[PDB]
Design a binder for these strands. Structure first.
Ligand code: MG
Ligand code: MG
Ligand code: MG
Ligand code: MG
Ligand code: MG
Ligand code: MG
Ligand code: MG
Ligand code: MG
Ligand code: MG
Ligand code: MG
Ligand code: MG
Ligand code: MG
Ligand code: MG
Ligand code: MG
Ligand code: MG
Ligand code: MG
Ligand code: MG
Ligand code: MG
Ligand code: MG
Ligand code: MG
Ligand code: MG
Ligand code: MG
Ligand code: MG
Ligand code: MG
Ligand code: MG
Ligand code: MG
Ligand code: MG
Ligand code: MG
Ligand code: MG
Ligand code: MG
Ligand code: MG
Ligand code: MG
Ligand code: MG
Ligand code: MG
Ligand code: MG
Ligand code: MG
Ligand code: MG
Ligand code: MG
Ligand code: MG
Ligand code: MG
Ligand code: MG
Ligand code: MG
Ligand code: MG
Ligand code: MG
Ligand code: MG
Ligand code: MG
Ligand code: MG
Ligand code: MG
Ligand code: MG
Ligand code: MG
Ligand code: MG
Ligand code: MG
Ligand code: MG
Ligand code: MG
Ligand code: MG
Ligand code: MG
Ligand code: MG
Ligand code: MG
Ligand code: MG
Ligand code: MG
Ligand code: MG
Ligand code: MG
Ligand code: MG
Ligand code: MG
Ligand code: MG
Ligand code: MG
Ligand code: MG
Ligand code: MG
Ligand code: MG
Ligand code: MG
Ligand code: MG
Ligand code: MG
Ligand code: MG
Ligand code: MG
Ligand code: MG
Ligand code: MG
Ligand code: MG
Ligand code: MG
Ligand code: MG
Ligand code: MG
Ligand code: MG
Ligand code: MG
Ligand code: MG
Ligand code: MG
Ligand code: MG
Ligand code: MG
Ligand code: MG
Ligand code: MG
Ligand code: MG
Ligand code: MG
Ligand code: MG
Ligand code: MG
Ligand code: MG
Ligand code: MG
Ligand code: MG
Ligand code: MG
Ligand code: MG
Ligand code: MG
Ligand code: MG
Ligand code: MG
Ligand code: MG
Ligand code: MG
Ligand code: MG
Ligand code: MG
Ligand code: MG
Ligand code: ZN
Lengths: 70, 50, 87, 119, 102
RNA sequence: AUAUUGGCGAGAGACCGAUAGCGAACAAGUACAGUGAUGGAAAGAUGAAAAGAACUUUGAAAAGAGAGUGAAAAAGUACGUGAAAUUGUUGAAAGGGAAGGGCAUUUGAUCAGACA
RNA sequence: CGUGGAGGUCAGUGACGAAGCCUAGACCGUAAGGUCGGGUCGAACGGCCUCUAGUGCAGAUCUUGGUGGUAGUAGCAAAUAUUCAAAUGAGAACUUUGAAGACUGAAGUGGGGAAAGGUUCCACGUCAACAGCAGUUGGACGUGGGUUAGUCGAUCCUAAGAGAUGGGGAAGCUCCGUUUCAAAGGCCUGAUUUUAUGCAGGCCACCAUCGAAAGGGAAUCCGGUUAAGAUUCCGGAACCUGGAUAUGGAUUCUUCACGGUAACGUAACUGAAUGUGGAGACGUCGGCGCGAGCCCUGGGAGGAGUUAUCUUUUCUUCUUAAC
RNA sequence: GCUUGUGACGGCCCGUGAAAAUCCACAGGAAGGAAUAGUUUUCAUGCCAGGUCGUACUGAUAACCGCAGCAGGUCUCCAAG
RNA sequence: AAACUUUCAACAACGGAUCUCUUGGUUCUCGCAUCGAUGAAGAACGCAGCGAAAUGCGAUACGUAAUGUGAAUUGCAGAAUUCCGUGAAUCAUCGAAUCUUUGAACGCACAUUGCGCCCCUUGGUAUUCCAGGGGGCAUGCCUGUUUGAGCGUCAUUU
């Protein structure tokens, strides 16, 4: 949540099967948003986390409570 | 260790998840018989053998 | 020093996990598995070792496919579908 | 609720394709909800409906192909019968009933007579 | 009793040669057309130590009669031969140290 | 027509009865051991029904004491019965380098039968 | 005489208490044993005639399980060492904080990694077991959170070696062979303007592949930031590789740059096949020379300590990454 | 001075102290190219992109192997007065 | 005289014998003939509103379609439109599908979630570079098809 308020980053759990290109395009497509870069990592419960940085036009925090979580 | 195959990472992942106590609501089920978790594992009493 | 001080340097795996049987019986330098024989096309097993067979035969698994053959056989291997009636 | 199969089957290719997209939006939302809510069993039924649609969408495209192969030598291996590997090899009734030209003559001229003892 | 030492040598486990550093095999030129009708000129380009060998080797390079390129041979150096020397190999060649003659 | 300690489906027994019977009646080829091949356990039973002890009190708590449920808590998720070794308590007795034993009787305790 | 099971029978016993267990209570038998009372208990069980056997324990360093005396006993004594107070808490020799006394003494009891472990990391809660005293503490327990890369590693390469393939052995599982007695394969563009890519040359004959998280190897640094990540995020500033490409400059009417006697210079300054050269790329010890970081040190500008006495003093800050 | 780095030297050897990927250069001159305008991206500037997996912590008189929080064993870098 | 030791009993301990149970085991007998390149047996990782396992299943994941039944499921929550009904159910049946990563396991590898090639399509100003979607490429052998090789060899040109 903090990365969302302070960083303009959306954090998703994301398919293991999917790559940085695929994560980027799918956010871009599903959320009407532009993306700067996308870091990923495997969590220790064996699931994938994507830090998704939006471009400076977007306010990810705004975009968080529009997908509807807080 | 400290620089693993994904194979090994995976297994370790699966392991972490099996490392909870018995979800106590099972205790309430009709004919329930499982008292506690009889397959619990602990990093310094039993080694995973990978 | 052949006992415990020499045990101190046990920190290299002779065997890792077997792909075909997932067992840590995969000898690294020999590149074959001491349980199941991989990657021999056949599966290691021996008549002098019956517990071992018992430990691994069909039915000790899911039988994802074989499960359903005996029902299918009973119905004469029906194709198509079932229709309708009433009540 | 939970979509019905027989009601899906009267819709069109791109009605089902869309319904699918709706349940998928649906399902995406519940999962956002689920992690704010101490239980969310409604999700179970929206993810069973997706299955249902996919089933039907697949069902239809399949008996599409099956027909446009109905009645030819050669048709996709997975519309062929399954039976059993052995069964599947196994001489056809034709290539099995086959009888030597010479033998046929014999089968005709001297077949097993029905008869009876008594008088 | 046990298998004696000189029987274990044949399986060449710990017993093979220590080869990693050797220059290559020492060999005369392939007895081609030049060498058996006339002679052919070369140049010793280098005379050099072969590990685990007594005598130095001589890298000697020749022209390919059939392709435009240099094919280099490895000789065992005779006493006297030198970097820069011209070596003659062939039936109709002359009788000085270094040359190769039938 | 013959074979069959495998497979599927069935009917059976002067068979075993939880240390028995298959190793496994149970999350058993599990847990655990071994580098590996392999080795491989223990472990069933509250009650008809959880009615699984509200409430009060002492306690930091675990629990104890009451109360309550119940046909029974001399059934309390240590739970049917609940032997023995071995232990606590109470009561009785004996004991100057073991104890226990045989025949016999005193003393104490305890008891049957028979009288009519 | 006694046990488990079987045929017959007593229309046998029993929830108004079967079986079992307990009892220096009673009775029958020479004895194996039988019978009863009382207590406990809870669902089955026995007499007689016969049938049947996995049918009787004190021993087998017997098997499994349980239990003693030993005994509150041996012991809990290596690694110099502890102390006062507060706070917390039901509880403090042992937790937290402050004070003091010491230790490791940079060949560390410091700061990091390789193998190996796999969540032990971090927060919060927390003491039944566990840490051979304790426990409010923990690498324990419950619940959660945490591991961000074009530039770090892997990935590529080849080493000892491993190992498919035409093959040759072997009844066969398979053994031998690795470029070997093999018809072993693919790049550059041209020919197309039926059109997407057939033929036209010319090559090149290299013959799998796996095998290094210390060998070889394209390229990133400083500052900042977290409870827990950082050469990975944030900030700033770079670099390499692939792909596209235009603008500028350079060059040409002596077409494919000039200058320098030369070593050679430069912002550029076309170049296919084929060939060659170099780099990758390399022992060890010794003294000598130089660099960097550390060490020592003067002045000055700050801050701290000592000051009964003495000391223009003791201690410390004064730095500069890749590119 | 100390640690490290590096240079030109020197001693030693019946020891003379890897390989390959990969990069560049040169010899060659097939070819393609200007004046009504051509050639040039090994000069400068400019555009786009860079996947996958590992990354926590311990590395030891308690996070590894020795039945264990065992006086044992277990490869290494930094190093003040 | 206590204490202590020992013996007996009662109440209480310790331990789990004994009795009685039995969705198991064993053995006999009868009927039956069905694994797999249409990817088997086996492995690994996953999947539930709230599961660590056992059981089930595969990104359509304790299930989807169909069929029969005819009102449950149940530990708690839940749906509530599903109860004179194309209809409950952790139901039965099962003819239709889905079926991750693998395995004889098949593009090459594999202590790597490592590395190619080909076709169709979509995006990036692209036959060539990058990216997303789909579909493909193991080996031996048989019949056939096509392209070929060899003075092995027959004819036919001028
Ligand atoms: Mg903001
Ligand atoms: Mg990453
Ligand atoms: Mg050992
Ligand atoms: Mg080894
Ligand atoms: Mg082998
Ligand atoms: Mg194989
Ligand atoms: Mg349904
Ligand atoms: Mg067929
Ligand atoms: Mg011999
Ligand atoms: Mg050799
Ligand atoms: Mg049988
Ligand atoms: Mg019968
Ligand atoms: Mg048993
Ligand atoms: Mg018996
Ligand atoms: Mg047993
Ligand atoms: Mg049972
Ligand atoms: Mg156990
Ligand atoms: Mg009972
Ligand atoms: Mg019991
Ligand atoms: Mg019960
Ligand atoms: Mg009480
Ligand atoms: Mg009663
Ligand atoms: Mg009772
Ligand atoms: Mg009772
Ligand atoms: Mg209770
Ligand atoms: Mg009891
Ligand atoms: Mg007497
Ligand atoms: Mg008798
Ligand atoms: Mg009897
Ligand atoms: Mg018996
Ligand atoms: Mg007695
Ligand atoms: Mg009597
Ligand atoms: Mg009584
Ligand atoms: Mg009784
Ligand atoms: Mg009863
Ligand atoms: Mg008898
Ligand atoms: Mg016996
Ligand atoms: Mg006896
Ligand atoms: Mg005995
Ligand atoms: Mg005895
Ligand atoms: Mg005896
Ligand atoms: Mg005994
Ligand atoms: Mg004590
Ligand atoms: Mg003592
Ligand atoms: Mg001692
Ligand atoms: Mg003392
Ligand atoms: Mg000490
Ligand atoms: Mg202390
Ligand atoms: Mg000191
Ligand atoms: Mg020292
Ligand atoms: Mg220490
Ligand atoms: Mg560390
Ligand atoms: Mg560890
Ligand atoms: Mg901690
Ligand atoms: Mg405690
Ligand atoms: Mg511990
Ligand atoms: Mg303790
Ligand atoms: Mg304690
Ligand atoms: Mg924890
Ligand atoms: Mg956790
Ligand atoms: Mg690098
Ligand atoms: Mg790569
Ligand atoms: Mg071979
Ligand atoms: Mg390799
Ligand atoms: Mg490397
Ligand atoms: Mg390296
Ligand atoms: Mg963070
Ligand atoms: Mg850190
Ligand atoms: Mg930093
Ligand atoms: Mg940055
Ligand atoms: Mg910038
Ligand atoms: Mg470029
Ligand atoms: Mg110029
Ligand atoms: Mg070269
Ligand atoms: Mg070289
Ligand atoms: Mg080297
Ligand atoms: Mg740099
Ligand atoms: Mg050094
Ligand atoms: Mg030298
Ligand atoms: Mg060069
Ligand atoms: Mg030409
Ligand atoms: Mg350039
Ligand atoms: Mg690529
Ligand atoms: Mg780290
Ligand atoms: Mg430690
Ligand atoms: Mg350990
Ligand atoms: Mg162990
Ligand atoms: Mg130790
Ligand atoms: Mg007195
Ligand atoms: Mg009593
Ligand atoms: Mg019994
Ligand atoms: Mg009963
Ligand atoms: Mg039976
Ligand atoms: Mg029968
Ligand atoms: Mg098998
Ligand atoms: Mg279930
Ligand atoms: Mg449910
Ligand atoms: Mg119906
Ligand atoms: Mg069902
Ligand atoms: Mg699917
Ligand atoms: Mg393969
Ligand atoms: Mg793969
Ligand atoms: Mg594909
Ligand atoms: Mg053919
Ligand atoms: Mg032909
Ligand atoms: Zn295996």
């Amino acid at each position: 949540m903090k990365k969302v308020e302070d960083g303009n980053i959306l954090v998703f759990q994301v398919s293991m099967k999917a790559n940085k290109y695929q994560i980027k395009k799918a956010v871009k497509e599903l959320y009407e948003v532009d993306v700067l870069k996308v870091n990923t990592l495997v969590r220790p419960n064996g699931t994938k986390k994507a830090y998704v940085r939006l471009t400076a036009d977007y306010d990810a925090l705004d975009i968080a409570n529009r997908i509807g979580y807080i | 260790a400290a620089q693993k195959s994904f194979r090994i990472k995976q297994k370790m992942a699966k392991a972490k998840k099996q490392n909870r106590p018995l979800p106590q609501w099972i205790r309430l089920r009709t004919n329930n018989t499982i008292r506690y978790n009889a397959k619990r594992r602990n990093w310094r009493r039993t080694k995973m053998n990978i | 020093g052949k006992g415990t001080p020499s045990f101190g340097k046990r920190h290299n795996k002779s065997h890792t996990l077997c792909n075909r049987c997932g067992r840590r019986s995969f000898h690294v330098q020999k590149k074959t598995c001491s349980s199941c024989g991989y990657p021999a096309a056949k599966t290691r097993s021996y008549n002098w070792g019956a517990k071992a067979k018992r430990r691994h035969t069909t039915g000790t698994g899911r039988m994802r496919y074989l499960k359903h053959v005996s029902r299918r056989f009973k119905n004469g291997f029906q194709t198509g579908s079932a229709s309708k009636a009433s009540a | 609720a939970g979509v019905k199969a027989y009601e899906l089957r009267t819709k069109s290719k791109e009605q089902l394709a869309s319904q699918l997209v709706d349940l998928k939006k649906e399902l995406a939302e519940l999962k956002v909800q689920k992690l704010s809510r101490p239980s969310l069993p409604k999700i179970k039924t929206v993810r069973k409906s997706i299955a249902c649609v996919l089933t039907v969408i697949n069902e239809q495209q399949r008996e599409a192909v099956r027909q446009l192969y109905k009645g030819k030598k050669y048709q996709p291996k997975d519309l062929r019968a399954k039976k059993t590997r052995a069964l599947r090899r196994a001489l056809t009734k034709f290539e099995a009933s086959q009888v030597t030209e010479k033998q046929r003559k014999k089968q005709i001229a001297f077949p097993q007579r029905k008869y009876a003892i008594k008088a | 009793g046990r298998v004696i030492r000189n029987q274990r040598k044949g399986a060449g486990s710990i017993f093979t040669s220590h080869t990693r550093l050797r220059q290559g095999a020492a060999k005369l030129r392939t007895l081609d057309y030049a060498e058996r009708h006339g002679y052919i000129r070369g140049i010793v380009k280098q005379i050099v130590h072969d590990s685990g060998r007594g005598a130095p080797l001589a890298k000697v390079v020749f022209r390919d009669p059939y392709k435009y390129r240099l094919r280099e041979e490895i000789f065992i150096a005779n006493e006297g031969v030198h970097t820069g020397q011209f070596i003659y190999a062939g039936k109709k060649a002359s009788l000085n140290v270094g040359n190769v003659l039938p």
